[PDB]
Amino acid sequence: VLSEGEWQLVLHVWAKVEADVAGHGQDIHIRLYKSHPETLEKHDRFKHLKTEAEMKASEDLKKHGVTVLTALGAILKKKGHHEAELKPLAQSHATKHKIPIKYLEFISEAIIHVLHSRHPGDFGADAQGAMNKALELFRKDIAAKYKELGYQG
């Protein structure tokens, strides 16, 4: 559970993310793929992408990152009351894409890194702590939904 103050900090930085969902998404994916090269293997149309510039140039990847962060943003806005938003996402990621919780930590780390890089003055210790607790909550609940669907990774 987050405090109301923690949610605010979460949603305050999120509003900043929303000034350029596309760019944030690209940075988060590029960081994810470079930090944890095994994650790229989940994406068939993203393996032809060999350099940081090809990634940035890929309209497919850019669109996808907007889809990711839109879905995560909508989750965050519910301040924990996110079962309806989280279920379809558990569903595809558990039974179709097969994304281990470990990979959700990796992208969570990339999110934190990109957030700090782009918004250091709106992402100090408290705001980092809060986004961290939010992503941890997202991860705990999605893991519980993975298990409900029969998926252990």
Ligand code: HEM
């Ligand atoms: C913040 C965490 C994440 C959010 C909110 C998220 C959200 C989404 C959404 C909304 C879609 C499109 C609909 C769907 O299939 O669910 C999607 C597709 C997908 N996601 Fe995730 N995702 C997240 C993490 C990941 C990670 C870490 C991987 C791989 C390491 C991944 C792999 C995929 C793949 C392979 C697809 C289908 C893309 C396609 O082939 O068209 N996702 N993601």
